[PDB]
Amino acid sequence: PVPTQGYRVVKRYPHDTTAFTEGLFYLRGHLYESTGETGRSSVRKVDLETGRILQRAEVPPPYFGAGIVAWRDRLIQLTWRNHEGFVYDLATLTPRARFRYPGEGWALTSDDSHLYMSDGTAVIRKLDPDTLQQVGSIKVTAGGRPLDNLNELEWVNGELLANVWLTSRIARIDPASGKVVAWIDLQALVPDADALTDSTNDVLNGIAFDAEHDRLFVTGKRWPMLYEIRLTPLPH
Ligand SMILES: [Ca+2]
């Protein structure tokens, strides 16, 4: 069976409890965070240490923003059920382009050549960053069972991390095979794993990796904190 990998909390940082997190990434010392509601949706540039909003953009109405990723000088964002995505200039957070895709947009991340998109199914789409056209896919499995409902992604050291909200776990995925190589069980950080929870409640929904300093951050909808966590090496 798939092993469970340990972790430790390095540091807790403040997080704004108005942030209904829909995606997160880190770039050049700041966090960028999507916040989801069809009735007010935003992309925020956030100071890590203080949790304060430095800059924000409103998602084009009537859409609800979903996952986000940086690519070069751009910020690319999905929408939940609008079929529509947006590209912003990163520096000014002003919208510059739009694109359309089949299905629901849940989460995005990127490696050095491609974007990776979750749509709630077990098949992650690999996209060309400039055209947004689909050029490949990864079928994700854990011990052979399809794994769907992946509400956040983050690329970390050649692997894809994906949150599985209904089990409170992050899957570390080998992108070459699509196989889950380990679970990380973050139930300890979820504000209340004990109650009846839907995907709109205080679920983990932001995973961001600072590759320059090898820092992994996690937060979620209305969480009071953002955590830097260090994964414990697995044996074998
Ligand atoms: Ca992310």
Side-chain angles (χ1 to χ4, degrees):
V2 173
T4 298
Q5 174 172 31
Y7 72 97
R8 67 178 177 90
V9 173
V10 174
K11 191 166 173 174
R12 301 169 187 247
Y13 299 86
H15 180 244
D16 181 355
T17 57
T18 68
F20 290 23
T21 310
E22 288 295 357
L24 191 75
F25 66 81
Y26 173 94
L27 177 67
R28 263 62 100 354
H30 299 107
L31 295 161
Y32 286 82
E33 188 173 4
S34 183
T35 62
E37 190 163 339
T38 143
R40 180 138 141 191
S41 199
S42 78
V43 179
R44 299 171 178 207
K45 177 184 180 185
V46 178
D47 181 64
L48 172 66
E49 291 288 355
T50 65
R52 286 171 183 169
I53 301 166
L54 304 174
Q55 205 182 356
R56 69 149 82 205
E58 302 313 313
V59 169
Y63 321 86
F64 172 130
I68 52 165
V69 63
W71 182 261
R72 300 195 186 263
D73 60 325
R74 304 185 303 275
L75 191 162
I76 302 170
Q77 182 176 36
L78 310 172
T79 58
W80 182 27
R81 280 177 183 189
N82 310 109
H83 301 300
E84 282 197 278
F86 297 112
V87 176
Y88 301 83
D89 175 72
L90 240 199
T92 57
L93 297 180
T94 52
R96 292 313 212 267
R98 67 125 186 91
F99 59 96
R100 262 194 213 6
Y101 50 82
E104 284 189 358
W106 286 43
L108 284 172
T109 188
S110 72
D111 64 6
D112 52 10
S113 297
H114 292 88
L115 310 183
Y116 298 87
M117 176 175 162
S118 169
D119 62 1
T121 76
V123 175
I124 298 171
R125 312 175 188 180
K126 189 175 187 202
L127 310 179
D128 175 60
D130 287 351
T131 58
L132 298 127
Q133 294 175 24
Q134 179 166 355
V135 300
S137 58
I138 293 159
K139 200 283 203 296
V140 186
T141 58
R145 296 168 56 179
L147 182 70
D148 71 12
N149 276 265
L150 302 178
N151 72 342
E152 171 61 338
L153 294 180
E154 186 64 8
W155 193 266
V156 180
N157 298 144
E159 288 179 313
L160 178 64
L161 293 192
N163 194 62
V164 189
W165 69 273
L166 57 92
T167 171
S168 301
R169 290 174 193 213
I170 294 177
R172 283 178 42 225
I173 301 155
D174 176 347
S177 71
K179 298 165 66 161
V180 174
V181 304
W183 304 120
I184 305 143
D185 181 358
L186 295 181
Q187 55 181 354
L189 304 187
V190 180
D192 97 316
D194 53 333
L196 176 72
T197 293
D198 64 43
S199 60
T200 83
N201 282 141
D202 301 3
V203 286
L204 197 157
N205 216 137
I207 303 166
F209 184 58
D210 166 3
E212 177 179 356
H213 308 100
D214 187 18
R215 303 188 294 170
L216 184 60
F217 300 109
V218 300
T219 195
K221 298 190 182 292
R222 303 206 288 161
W223 284 26
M225 294 183 271
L226 172 143
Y227 298 91
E228 179 178 345
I229 65 170
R230 193 90 71 233
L231 302 189
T232 301
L234 235 27
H236 166 285

